[PDB]
C-alpha cells in the first residue's frame, strides 16, 4: 500500500524522482513555462543536468515526507501551508499540482510494480484540497 510505496520510492529516489518528473513534463509540455532551464532538452540531456537532478530530488524528498506524515492519504495542514507559502511556488494554482499527480499515478499504473495507484490518486486530490484551503488559487 501507500506506506510501502513511500519506502519503494525512497529506496531509489533519484531514479523515481527523475522518471516521474519527466513523465509530468512530457505529458504536460506547457508546464515547462515554470521550468525554463529544462526547455529544448531530451530526457537523457536533462538527466545529466546538475540543476535537474537537484530539483527533482529535493521535490520528491519533500513529497515523500508529506506523504509519510499524512493519515489515510490526508496531508498535514502545516505541510500544505509550507507548499503554498514557498516563494518558489508563488505563481502556482492547484491545477499545476493536479497534473503532477495525474502523471505520477499514470506512471505507477504503467510500471510493472504493485504501487497502490488509487491511494496516490487520493493523496493528490486531498493535497489539492488542502492547498486550496491554505490559500492556493
Ligand atoms: C507536492 C508537490 C511539490 C513539492 C513537494 C515541491 C517541492 C519543491 C521544493 C522542495 C522546491 C525547492 C525549494 C528550495 O530550493 O528551497 C521547489 C521548487 C519549485 N517548484 Fe515545487 N514542489 C511541488 C509541486 C510543484 C508543482 C506542481 C510545480 C508546477 C509548476 C512546482 C514548481 C516549482 C518551481 C517553479 C520551483 C522553483 C524554480 C526552480 O526550480 O528553480 N512545484 N518545489
Amino acid at each position: 500500500g501507500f506506506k510501502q510505496d513511500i519506502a519503494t520510492l525512497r529506496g531509489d529516489l533519484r531514479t523515481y524522482a527523475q522518471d516521474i518528473f519527466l513523465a509530468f513534463l512530457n505529458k504536460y509540455p506547457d508546464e515547462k513555462r515554470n521550468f525554463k532551464n529544462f526547455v529544448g532538452k531530451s530526457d537523457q540531456e536533462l538527466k545529466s543536468m546538475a540543476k535537474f537532478g537537484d530539483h527533482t530530488e529535493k521535490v520528491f524528498n519533500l513529497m515523500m515526507e508529506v506523504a509519510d506524515r499524512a493519515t489515510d492519504c490526508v496531508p498535514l495542514a502545516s505541510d500544505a501551508s509550507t507548499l503554498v507559502q514557498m516563494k518558489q511556488h508563488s505563481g502556482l494554482t492547484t491545477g499545476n499540482f493536479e497534473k503532477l499527480f495525474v502523471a505520477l499515478v499514470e506512471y505507477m499504473r504503467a510500471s510493472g510494480q504493485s504501487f497502490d495507484s488509487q491511494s496516490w490518486d487520493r493523496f493528490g486530490k486531498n493535497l489539492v484540497s488542502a492547498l486550496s484551503s491554505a490559500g492556493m488559487k
Side-chain angles (χ1 to χ4, degrees), residues 42-50 52-61:
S42 71
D43 289 9
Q44 288 302 102
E45 296 171 320
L46 290 168
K47 290 180 156 255
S48 240
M49 290 187 26
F52 181 86
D54 295 348
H55 171 76
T56 58
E57 290 251 283
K58 289 188 177 174
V59 168
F60 277 79
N61 283 339

Side-chain angles (χ1 to χ4, degrees), residues 34-35 55 58-59 63 86 88-89 92 96-97 127:
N34 300 103
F35 308 101
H55 171 76
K58 289 188 177 174
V59 168
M63 191 198 293
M86 278 171 57
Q88 298 90 337
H89 289 174
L92 308 183
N96 293 114
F97 290 75
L127 177 65

Side-chain angles (χ1 to χ4, degrees), residues 89-108 110-122:
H89 289 174
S90 52
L92 308 183
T93 64
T94 57
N96 293 114
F97 290 75
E98 280 174 324
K99 289 173 177 66
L100 175 55
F101 280 96
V102 165
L104 175 151
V105 169
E106 293 202 353
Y107 170 95
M108 289 179 168
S111 95
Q113 307 189 61
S114 52
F115 288 110
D116 180 4
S117 269
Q118 298 320 119
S119 287
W120 291 93
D121 191 49
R122 294 194 301 273

Side-chain angles (χ1 to χ4, degrees), residues 2-35 38-50 52-86 88-108 110-128:
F2 192 68
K3 283 293 188 171
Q4 177 52 37
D5 291 347
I6 295 168
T8 296
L9 297 162
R10 280 175 165 163
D12 199 5
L13 195 43
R14 194 155 187 106
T15 292
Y16 282 124
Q18 283 186 164
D19 289 354
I20 293 168
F21 195 61
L22 287 172
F24 167 67
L25 294 182
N26 285 333
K27 182 175 189 66
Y28 302 103
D30 281 0
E31 292 283 345
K32 282 199 182 183
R33 172 179 292 265
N34 300 103
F35 308 101
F38 302 158
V39 163
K41 295 295 223 161
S42 71
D43 289 9
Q44 288 302 102
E45 296 171 320
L46 290 168
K47 290 180 156 255
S48 240
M49 290 187 26
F52 181 86
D54 295 348
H55 171 76
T56 58
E57 290 251 283
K58 289 188 177 174
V59 168
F60 277 79
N61 283 339
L62 182 56
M63 191 198 293
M64 291 304 96
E65 284 184 77
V66 176
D68 205 11
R69 291 191 284 263
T71 296
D72 295 345
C73 305
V74 180
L76 296 184
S78 58
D79 279 325
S81 291
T82 293
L83 290 169
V84 171
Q85 298 185 320
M86 278 171 57
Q88 298 90 337
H89 289 174
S90 52
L92 308 183
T93 64
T94 57
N96 293 114
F97 290 75
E98 280 174 324
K99 289 173 177 66
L100 175 55
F101 280 96
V102 165
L104 175 151
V105 169
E106 293 202 353
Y107 170 95
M108 289 179 168
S111 95
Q113 307 189 61
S114 52
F115 288 110
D116 180 4
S117 269
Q118 298 320 119
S119 287
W120 291 93
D121 191 49
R122 294 194 301 273
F123 175 67
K125 290 181 179 306
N126 297 332
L127 177 65
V128 162

